[PDB]
Amino acid sequence: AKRQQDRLMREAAYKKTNETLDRWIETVKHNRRAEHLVFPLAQNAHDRGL
Amino acid sequence: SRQNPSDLERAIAGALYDLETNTADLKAALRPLQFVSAREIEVGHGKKAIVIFVPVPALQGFHRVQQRLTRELEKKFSDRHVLILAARRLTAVHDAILTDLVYPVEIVGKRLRTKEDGSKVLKVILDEKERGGVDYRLDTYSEVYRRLTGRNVTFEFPQ
Amino acid sequence: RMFAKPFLGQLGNGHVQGVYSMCKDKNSLNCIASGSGDGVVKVWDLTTRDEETWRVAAHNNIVKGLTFTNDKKLLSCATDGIKLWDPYASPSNTTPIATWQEGGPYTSLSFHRSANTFAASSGQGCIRIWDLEHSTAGQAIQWPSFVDTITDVCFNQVETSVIGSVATDRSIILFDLRTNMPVIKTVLHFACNRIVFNPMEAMNLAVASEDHNIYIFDARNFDKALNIQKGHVAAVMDVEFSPTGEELVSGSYDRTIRLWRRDAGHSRDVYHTKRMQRVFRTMWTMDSKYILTGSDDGNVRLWRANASERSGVKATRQRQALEYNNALLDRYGHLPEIRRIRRHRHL
Amino acid sequence: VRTSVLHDALNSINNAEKMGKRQVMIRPSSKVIVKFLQVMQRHGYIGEFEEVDNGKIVVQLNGRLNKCGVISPRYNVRLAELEKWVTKLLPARQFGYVILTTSAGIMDHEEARRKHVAGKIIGFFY
Amino acid sequence: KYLATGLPHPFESQQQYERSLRLPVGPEWMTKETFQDATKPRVIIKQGIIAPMSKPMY
Amino acid sequence: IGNLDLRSEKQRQAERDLNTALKKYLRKQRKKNIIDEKRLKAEELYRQM
Amino acid sequence: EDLYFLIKKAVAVRKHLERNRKDKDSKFRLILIESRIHRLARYYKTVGVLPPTWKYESSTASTLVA
Amino acid sequence: IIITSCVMAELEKLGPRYRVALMIARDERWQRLTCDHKGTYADDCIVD
Amino acid sequence: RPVDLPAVGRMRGAELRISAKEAAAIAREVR
RNA sequence: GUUUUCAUUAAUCAGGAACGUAAACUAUU
RNA sequence: GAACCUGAUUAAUAGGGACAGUCG
Ligand SMILES: [Zn+2]
Helix, strand or coil: CHHHHHHHHHHHHHHHHHHHHHCCHHHHHHHHHCCCEEECCHHHCCCCCC | CCCCCCCCHHHHHHHHHHCCCCCCCCCCCCCCCCCCCEEEEECCCCCEEEEEEECCCHHHHHHCCCCCHHHHHHHCCCCCEEEEEECCCCHHHHHHHHHHHCCCCCCCCEEEEECCCCCEEEEEECCCCCCCCCCCCHHHHHHHHHHHCCCCEEEECCC | CCCCCCEEEECCCCCCCCEEEEEECCCCCCEEEEEECCCCEEEEECCCCCCCCEEECCCCCCCCCEEECCCCCEEECCCCCEEEECCCCCCCCCCCCEEECCCCCEEEEEECCCCCEEEEEECCCEEEEEECCCCCCCEEEECCCCCCCEEEEEECCCCCCEEEEEECCCEEEEEECCCCEEEEEEECCCCEEEEEECCCCCCEEEEEECCCEEEEEECCCCCCCCEEEECCCCCEEEEEECCCCCEEEEEECCCCEEEEECCCCCCCEEECCCCCCCEEEEEECCCCCEEEEEECCCCEEEEECCCCCCCCCCCHHHHHHHHHHHHHHHHHCCCHHHHHHHHCCCC | CCCCHHHHHHHHHHHHHHHCCCCCEECCCCCHHHHHHHHHHHCCCCCEEEEECCCEEEEECCCCCCCEEEECCCCEECHHHHHHHHHHHCCECCECEEEEEECCEEEEHHHHHHHCCCEEEEEEEC | CCCECCCCCCCCCHHHHHHHCCCCCCCCCCCHHHHHHHCCCCEEECCCCCCCCCCCCC | CCCECHHHHHHHHHHHHCCCCCCHHHHHHCCCCCCCCHHHHHHHHHHHC | CHHHHHHHHHHHHHHHHHHHCCCCHHHHHHHHHHHHHHHHHHHHHHHCCCCCCCCCCCHHHHHHHC | CEEEHHHHHHHHHCCHHHHHHHHHHCCCCCEEECCCCCCCCHHHHHHC | CCCCCCCCCEEECCEEECCHHHHHHHHHHHC
């Protein structure tokens, strides 16, 4: 059925999006477990490697 | 009645004739019915759904037995959504078309929800006690109702 | 409690009718815009708050959504349909340079972080996604049989191509832009007014909902809320994470702004004023020090978070005294006298 | 008993706009009420309403309107009278609208001046 | 009124909390380096655009 | 300054989670002379003992 | 019929009132029930389901229990 | 026709019953004289 | 007194009653 | 309460009709 | 003085009646 085919395709999309947020889990974990956070980030600087 | 047959009217009438013998051991509205009316216009893309029109006391004569009649009409004929309805020729007629569309399940409410401009969307809710076997038939219900009447409605179980 | 003086100012003369939408520029630092209820939008510069920089009688109805592009231009929704203006040009132009009416009644906007893509939440139950300069009608992504209006839409700024939305089915829905389809849909108990994402943690979101409540959810596991902030009286109208990702502003439907920590579950601060009539849109500046409040009195007000902490350059024995006081309150903040004086606020 | 079900509905809308609620349950529905709220929704003073059936109307309101009212004897009005009736009913000519049951339907006074048709004054909001 | 009425939220034991505070923060009782390291704030916000994080750090 | 009020902590946890002495009990509670159904249960216990 | 049950209640009330004759609450309820009878009877006259010369004072009560 | 910010302040300090008079005052075509004083008392502002 | 109340007739709840003289007074003012 | 019926029968009171020693501190909320 | 409407309606969140257990 169209509803079940849509449900399986969107379950596959949910697994792909969970993979692309599991790439962020480790940095979120280090930011919540760290002792001192420095904002703004070093990676967002407009002169990063100069 | 009203018809001289098309290509599939004689096939569905032969199915109604063949359900008399060579089978069950169940016939109450099967012998007092003749060739009546049928229509074959698409639902979604790829699939179609057969509707058959019924004389107006034979709608309660068919409310007598519709379990496993529509199952064998789905299985033994063409593997598509079978659907019976009365034939008619205003708002009470469209209400009748809805409540004879949904045959096991009683509709509860109609919510005519407008939008932030003049556009409006009707949405008729169903009964909660029967949910599992109807949800794959809901888009067929909505599309057959659009194709017969012209008013876009969408069917939804309440949550 | 003595030097807690949070009100800083008010942007210009304000609007005529109430401020029903406003949006910052996430690339710049002093570019704000606000669209009122009589359909006039104004672009403000935060360095010179005396008068507006650019105003136009944009639409007929109220301005429901509004955003800035990543180049310099701004977009605005209405029930009319969305429009695009160039507010920074050497002649001032009142006329739009693009308009879009097909796609039902639009409700909100959200711009992409990097590219020129933006998604508009419509009232037909779909969102539709445009790319500027090579798309005209956009691509309409929807839940397959969906009827109720999608109220808010928000691009995830950390993880690009993940779009969250709330809808008046008391539901939140996700969207993956890479494979253009919806992803997951959860029905909550009450309607949600606004979704927002965390700018430091890509997976956490917050819904401001008519349950007087803020729900911090995890986008990978929608089983339970990560946190439930409950402090309000009337419904929550707007929520916004701080750009450091550790605090929240919520403007409510009664006359209150509530400032929250991320793990708190109860109010750090409450801001209110007899002149402030209702609160509709609250958002931080990109300093993460000042917050802005678009009210129903037609006023955009500039408050500060950390109400007793003054800005500017401090001497070392000044900021050491302030940091020493904050560490000392972190330790002894739970004792009874200290607790009652630090929790007392005049509502 | 107030047979004016439009007045009962508009009394409920005024009570909600005073009490700061975000929706109502207009218990007796009609069609003139639906047209009234259609005009209010055109001019943006009411968010979104639905007619559910037993029926009743659920009216999401934005918190933008001040007062609803019905003119109870429903006096007839021409255009040269309509200008003075607008400036005597509304606090300002640019704020709020007067509702008219014309031969072209039910609409506001600006749409009546657009479509060049007069009629009876039925209500007003601002 | 100087005793504490209940345990604070993360703590699980009376010995844990009443032995976890244990040391004065102030500059009279600790050295200057210790005082600086113990009253550094957790989140250090400098001025500027605090843009959301582009790429994963770890 | 900052130590536990142990009585208040025990009461907080209570409101969150919610043959040699039973003769001097009656010796102390025969003098009131409130009858007080816990003393009726104690009298039945003393009769069983 | 509604009118039939109402006139039956009226005959029952008047018979009890004739046997007792002293109370006033039954007389007041009799006045209420006779007003109700006359109003429903007038609506059924202006529809026309019954004769327009048919009347109930006490003789119709007597000839419908008899 | 000018309106001082003390006058706008007292019109805003009065409740949402006066929202129509507030919008009428907040019509855009009029001059807004910003005031540099403390109390937002319209009588003393106008007299000074 | 309330500012928002219109000047033609009396207001009771959401119902605004206009006497027959007042609708005649506006028609006199137009002519 | 019902797995009960006719479907405007209704609302309000001009006229009229039935019942009959005291006072003294006070559309929702 | 209800709503509904390019051979007999909604069955009213107004009526009157019937039945049952009751209640004072
Ligand atoms: Zn002044």
